[PDB]
Assembly symmetry: C2
Homo-oligomer: 103 residues x 2
């Protein structure tokens, strides 16, 4: 079961990114490789370093814009035929939201 | 002939320029001198995305960072009132620094 959320907690977004963008298997909120080795999940939606892994991982062109408006950041992901667009107060969250929108 | 081409610029040189021209830090012997007596190293602005993002949020203009699959890979827009400053680079950190310096009248080829 699933539900469309208007705004999800970073911890939850990091899991969606882990599996949907990086294809990792998640189990009880950990990444599990080869079905037996556990790893913690990167804070994609909080660190720009982690979030940048997202930017590079995506196959599409990506635009990150910083302004002084509200919300501060805007991200564009150019999916074939159409472009996804999102807003967020931080670059890492706008990046993750854009990535998830393109999938 | 009024202008001349400078000596080669290494990433570490770009970082020094960022520290002083963008952050206004005190630079003495490749160090950021805090309180005129305490020194720190200069962050890898042109190499680390965390350091480079500090530059993004420092610049007072809107900034845009684009990653494309064509070349050069990265493009940065710094929206200076006079007219946007756009640069290219193979990495986001370097493109960010190149664009920040262009916003302070320091082009880089």
């Amino acid at each position: 079961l699933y539900f469309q959320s208007n705004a999800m907690k970073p911890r939850d977004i990091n899991k969606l990114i882990a599996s949907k963008i990086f294809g990792y298997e998640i189990k009880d909120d950990n990444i599990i490789k080869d079905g037996r080795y556990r790893l913690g999940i990167p804070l994609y939606s909080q660190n720009i370093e982690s979030a940048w892994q997202v930017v590079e991982k995506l196959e599409y062109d990506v635009k990150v814009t910083k302004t002084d408006l509200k919300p501060k950041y805007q991200v564009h992901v150019f999916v074939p035929g159409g472009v996804k667009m999102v807003f967020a107060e931080t670059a890492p969250m706008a990046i993750c939201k854009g990535a998830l929108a393109s999938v």
